Amino acid sequence: KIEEGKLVIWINGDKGYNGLAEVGKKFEKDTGIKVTVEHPDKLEEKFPQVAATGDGPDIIFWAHDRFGGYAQSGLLAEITPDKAFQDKLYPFTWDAVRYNGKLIAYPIAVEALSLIYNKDLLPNPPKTWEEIPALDKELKAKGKSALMFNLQEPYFTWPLIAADGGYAFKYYDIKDVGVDNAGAKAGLTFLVDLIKNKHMNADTDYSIAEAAFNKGETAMTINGPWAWSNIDTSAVNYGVTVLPTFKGQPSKPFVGVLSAGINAASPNKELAKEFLENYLLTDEGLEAVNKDKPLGAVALKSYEEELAKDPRIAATMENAQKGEIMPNIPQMSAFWYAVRTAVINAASGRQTVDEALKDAQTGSELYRQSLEIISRYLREQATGAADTAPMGASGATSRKALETLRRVGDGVQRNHETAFQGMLRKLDIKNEDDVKSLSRVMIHVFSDGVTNWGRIVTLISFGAFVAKHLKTINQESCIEPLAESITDVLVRTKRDWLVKQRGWDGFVEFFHV
Ligand SMILES: CCc1sc2ncnc(N[C@H](Cc3ccccc3)C(=O)O)c2c1-c1cccc2[nH]ccc12
Ligand SMILES: OC[C@H]1O[C@H](O[C@H]2[C@H](O)[C@@H](O)[C@@H](O)O[C@@H]2CO)[C@H](O)[C@@H](O)[C@@H]1O
Ligand code: NA
């Protein structure tokens, strides 16, 4: 389905895609291979959908946080640069694109948000979030505003949520989610108060913040290096500086490494490797991209040493040091989807902060909590003995849901025994190969009919039935993969329903005696 003897590249519409296209033409001049650069909308959502059918671009550019999901789903080629090429880029940039001990992409550039301020309106930018309300009252008296930034993407609000102790995954313990802790609450409450007190507008997006800053209407924005080009063109006298503190603590931006992955379905992997290693990741390659839209602190040592004298890059790295490198684990997609919704709902008043972050903590934890319950149930059903290990400090839900599933699922296996035996005989489950096939079937069976807990119990009960069979034919090793597939089916297709029901607390409530 992907065309051979050509390279299609996807990169986000805020990056230097014209610069990338020049590196494309320089690859074409020397090889006669034509490089097409596209910047589709929602490309981080559209990559997994199309790559999963063997389609999409040869090369996908995004921050590293989305690459573990892609690698887990088999969408990316392992990359195997020799040691002489590895030594040309900073090791911590390689760490960002290492997943299960394999390099799954090429690192390009280190991205961190900074505070961007109009030196003509605000010769001394605030050191603290707390002084922005008073500052805004002062600028409003002159027909200006203190601060506008994109409230539609959680990335821009995360530094403030994280300042007083909010976090995604404790360092990575995916059992420890920091989305609804007191630190997160205090950060998002301060944001909502800025909106309530009319210092910010809940509808402000990328375009509105950018235009307001570049036209000199607002004294400050929050943005990455890519934004500096449009500000150069604007003639705004701007500075790039350390983010304001919150409760005396630094803002901690989530740090992204812009990364180039190679489609597993691509029949041009050697051309892609040749383009990325010998044309893009060179002094002339990165300069071409950088001149269009700044990359930040580039992964390439030679060229990073030239750019590091720029005070805007120094400020970028200063914000990077105070932030955290994002996790690349497959949970990150769901974490971002949850926190985006929480910030938008808290900002608009659809939900309170406590409500919004409660829903976001449930969404971020949903996968791991589902798998915990389902894997424990399938294993104990297969072996006749429960798992002895602790459920966690935050897993009282997990223990109650498993108790409910045991009580309710007891009957479902017994009543549907004849029908389960038939369906199992109608499939040929014999090894890990056959378990792959089940997902399509379960999806299709879960794709029609009504969404309720009874049907979820029926699905998991068939899972346990299969786990028992797997154990009988010495395929015990296939139980965890089966449990992952049932979890994947359940979470990927019913996420929004499950968050609505308060996830597994809902399940325990619905069948309470
Ligand atoms: C992959 C097997 C799966 S996953 C699955 N997920 C939800 N519900 C299922 N079953 C009920 C239909 C049903 C009810 C009672 C008796 C028999 C069937 C439902 O869809 O509500 C199934 C089935 C399933 C299992 C065994 C026989 C089956 N016959 C059709 C589906 C199905
Ligand atoms: O808003 C969540 C979003 O944050 C990051 O995306 C950034 C990206 O890293 C930057 O390169 C820049 O383009 O802005 C984006 C935010 O709009 C994560 O990388 C992304 O996965 C996540 O969805
Ligand atoms: Na986007």
For residue 454, give both structure tokens.
Answer: 């009874």
Ligand 1 lined by 427 (C-beta under 6 Å): no
Rounded Cα gap, residues 461 and 290, in angstroms: 55
For residue 493, give both structure tokens.
Answer: 């297709």
Count Cβ atoms below 10 Å from residue 430 Cβ, excluding itself.
13
Contact 429, 470 (CB under 8 A): yes
Ligand 2 lined by 336 (C-beta under 6 Å): yes
What are the residue ranges of helices labelled H in 179-326? 182-196, 206-214, 228-234, 269-275, 283-292, 301-307, 311-322
Ligand 1 lined by 451 (C-beta under 6 Å): no
Q: What is the 3-state secondary structure (H, E, C) of 448-477?
A: CCCCCHHHHHHHHHHHHHHHHHHHHCCCHH
**What residue owns the CA closest to ligand 2's atom 3?**
155
Rounded Cα gap, residues 90 and 95, in angstroms: 9
- Ligand 2 atom index nearest CA of 111: 11
Ligand 2 lined by 338 (C-beta under 6 Å): no
Ligand 1 lined by 419 (C-beta under 6 Å): yes
Burial class from Cβ neighbours inside 10 Å (0-12, 13-18, 19+) for residue 347 reads: buried
Ligand 2 lined by 376 (C-beta under 6 Å): no
Q: Residue 328 carries which side chain, given as an amino acid letter?
A: N
Contact 141, 298 (CB under 8 A): no
Rounded Cα gap, residues 460 and 218, in angstroms: 54
CA neighbor of 360 nearest in space, from 168, 163, 165, 203: 168
CA neighbor of 209 nearest in space, from 149, 157, 154: 149
Give φ, ψ of 198 to 5 degrees: 70, 20
From the CA of 335, the nearest ligand is 2
Describe the crossing of helices 453-472 and 396-415 by its angle, rounded to 10 degrees: 80
Ligand 1 lined by 208 (C-beta under 6 Å): no
Give φ, ψ of 178 to 5 degrees: -105, 25
Which residue from 445, 456, 460 has its CB within 8 A of the most atoms of ligand 1, so it is best to mutate? 445
Ligand 1 lined by 443 (C-beta under 6 Å): no
Q: Are strands 254-262 and 324-325 parallel, antiparallel or unpaired?
A: parallel
171-to-85, 325, 394 alpha-carbon distances in Å? 29, 11, 17
Residue at token pair 């329903």:
497
For residue 395, the SS3 value is coil
Distance in angstroms between the alpha carbons of the first and the last residue of the chain: 54
Rounded Cα gap, residues 134 and 128, in angstroms: 11
Rounded Cα gap, residues 153 and 159, in angstroms: 12
Count Cβ atoms below 10 Å from residue 222 Cβ, excluding itself.
25
Beta bridge partners of 222: 115
Q: Are strands 98-99 and 59-63 parallel, antiparallel or unpaired?
A: unpaired
Q: Residue 69 carries which side chain, given as an amino acid letter?
A: G
Q: Are strands 59-63 and 254-262 parallel, antiparallel or unpaired?
A: antiparallel
CA neighbor of 432 nearest in space, from 376, 462, 469, 470: 470
Question: Which value in Å is the resolution of this experimental model?
Answer: 2.2
Residues in the chain, how many?
513
Burial class from Cβ neighbours inside 10 Å (0-12, 13-18, 19+) for residue 447 reads: exposed
| Own/partner pairs, 348-356, CB within 8 angstroms, 24+ separation | 348/202, 349/202, 353/185, 353/188, 353/189, 353/192, 354/180, 354/185, 356/188
Supply angle C-alpha 328, 332, 338, rounded to 5: 165
Burial class from Cβ neighbours inside 10 Å (0-12, 13-18, 19+) for residue 309 reads: exposed
Give φ, ψ of 326 to 5 degrees: -65, 145
Ligand 2 lined by 44 (C-beta under 6 Å): yes
What is the residue-wise DSSP string for 42-72? THHHHHHHHHTTT-S-SEEEEEGGGHHHHHH
For residue 121, give both structure tokens.
Answer: 């309106």
Which residue from 62, 149, 155 has its CB within 8 A of the most atoms of ligand 2, so it is best to mutate? 155
Give φ, ψ of 305 to 5 degrees: -70, -35
Chain mean position to CA 481: 23
Contact 159, 224 (CB under 8 A): no
CA neighbor of 257 nearest in space, from 89, 64, 85, 504: 64
CA neighbor of 280 nearest in space, from 263, 296, 259: 259
Contact 504, 391 (CB under 8 A): no
For residue 81, give both structure tokens.
Answer: 């640069």
For residue 8, the SS3 value is strand
Ligand 2 lined by 256 (C-beta under 6 Å): yes
Rounded Cα gap, residues 42 and 46, in angstroms: 6
CA neighbor of 210 nearest in space, from 293, 148, 154: 148
Going from the Cα of 349 to the center of ligand 1, the distance in angstroms, rounded, reads 41
From the CA of 423, the nearest ligand is 1
Which regions of 303-400 does DSSP assign to beta strands (E)? 324-325
Ligand 1 lined by 485 (C-beta under 6 Å): no
Contact 174, 330 (CB under 8 A): no
40 in the Ramachandran plot: left (φ > 0), alpha (ψ -120 to 50) or beta? Answer: beta
Contact 110, 254 (CB under 8 A): no
- Ligand 2 atom index nearest CA of 64: 19
Contact 153, 14 (CB under 8 A): no
Assign domain 332-511 to its CATH architecture.
Answer: Orthogonal Bundle (1.10)
Count Cβ atoms below 10 Å from residue 170 Cβ, excluding itself.
11
Rounded Cα gap, residues 331 and 191, in angstroms: 25
CA neighbor of 172 nearest in space, from 103, 112, 95, 246: 95
For residue 103, give both structure tokens.
Answer: 């390099």
DSSP class of 89: B
Contact 271, 278 (CB under 8 A): no
For residue 193, give both structure tokens.
Answer: 């108060």
Q: Residue 106 carries which side chain, given as an amino acid letter?
A: Y
**Interacting residues of 112 by C-beta distance below 8 A, sequence separation 6+:** 224, 253, 255, 256, 296, 316, 317, 319, 320, 323
Which residue from 44, 110, 153 has its CB within 8 A of the most atoms of ligand 2, so it is best to mutate? 153
Method: X-ray
Which residue from 423, 428, 437, 482 has its CB within 8 A of the most atoms of ligand 1, so it is best to mutate? 423
Chain mean position to CA 12: 15
**Quick one: the chain helix, strand, coil %, rounded to 5?**
55, 15, 30
Going from the Cα of 249 to the center of ligand 2, the distance in angstroms, rounded, reads 23
Contact 354, 483 (CB under 8 A): no
For residue 509, give both structure tokens.
Answer: 């409530």
Ligand 2 lined by 296 (C-beta under 6 Å): no
Q: Are strands 167-170 and 173-178 parallel, antiparallel or unpaired?
A: antiparallel
**Interacting residues of 153 by C-beta distance below 8 A, sequence separation 6+:** 206, 340
Burial class from Cβ neighbours inside 10 Å (0-12, 13-18, 19+) for residue 285 reads: buried
Ligand 1 lined by 423 (C-beta under 6 Å): yes
What is the residue-wise DSSP string for 241-279? EPPPBBTTB---PEEEEEEEEEBTT-S-HHHHHHHIIII
Count Cβ atoms below 10 Å from residue 273 Cβ, excluding itself.
18
**What residue owns the CA closest to ligand 1's atom 31?**
445
Rounded Cα gap, residues 33 and 268, in angstroms: 10
DSSP H or E run through 169: strand 167-170
Describe the crossing of helices 503-510 and 453-472 by its angle, rounded to 10 degrees: 100
Which regions of 263-333 does DSSP assign to beta strands (E)? 297-298, 324-325
**CA quadruple 135, 141, 146, 150: dihedral, nearest 10:** 140
Going from the Cα of 47 to the center of ligand 2, the distance in angstroms, rounded, reads 15
Assign domain 114-254 to its CATH architecture.
Answer: 3-Layer(aba) Sandwich (3.40)
- Rg over alpha carbons for the chain, rounded to the nearest Å, is 25
Peptide-bond breaks in the chain following residues (C–N over 2.5 A): 171
Ligand 2 lined by 12 (C-beta under 6 Å): yes
For residue 327, give both structure tokens.
Answer: 């996790």
Describe the crossing of helices 432-447 and 479-500 by its angle, rounded to 10 degrees: 20
Rounded Cα gap, residues 349 and 299, in angstroms: 41
Chain mean position to CA 394: 23
For residue 141, give both structure tokens.
Answer: 């008296």
| Own/partner pairs, 32-39, CB within 8 angstroms, 24+ separation | 33/5, 33/6, 33/7, 33/271, 34/6, 34/7, 35/7, 35/9, 35/275, 36/6, 36/7, 36/8, 36/9, 37/9, 37/11, 38/8, 38/9, 38/10, 38/11, 39/10, 39/11, 39/12, 39/13, 39/15
Rounded Cα gap, residues 134 and 424, in angstroms: 68
**Interacting residues of 252 by C-beta distance below 8 A, sequence separation 6+:** 158, 159, 162, 163, 322, 323, 324
Rounded Cα gap, residues 20 and 26, in angstroms: 10
Ligand 1 lined by 420 (C-beta under 6 Å): yes
Ligand 1 lined by 248 (C-beta under 6 Å): no
